[PDB]
Design a protein around this ligand. Structure first.
Ligand code: SF4
Length: 81
């Protein structure tokens, strides 16, 4: 499976990821992206049909703030660093 999460500390509120994958990423009041599937906890598996959109958003993020993994993040966007 695949899991995703936003490191909100490095996000620059550019708007690209919600356009590339609107069913996965949205923005808080401050314009900072988060994963709507699981309230940015990195615990809900991304549906198979959405993986291509997720990878588009991941590759397109200017500051490498979107994370992807094959194992849950359990709330920590920096788990795999
Ligand atoms: S693409 Fe990256 S920097 Fe831009 S809003 Fe999404 S997470 Fe933030």
């Amino acid at each position: 499976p695949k899991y995703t999460i936003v490191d909100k500390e490095t996000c620059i509120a550019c708007g690209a990821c919600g356009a590339a994958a609107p069913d996965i990423y949205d923005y808080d009041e401050d314009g900072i992206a988060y994963v709507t599937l699981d309230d940015n906890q990195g615990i809900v598996e991304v549906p198979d049909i959405l993986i291509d959109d997720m990878m588009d958003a991941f590759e397109g993020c200017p500051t490498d703030s979107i994370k992807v993994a094959d194992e849950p993040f359990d709330g920590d966007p920096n788990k795999f660093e």
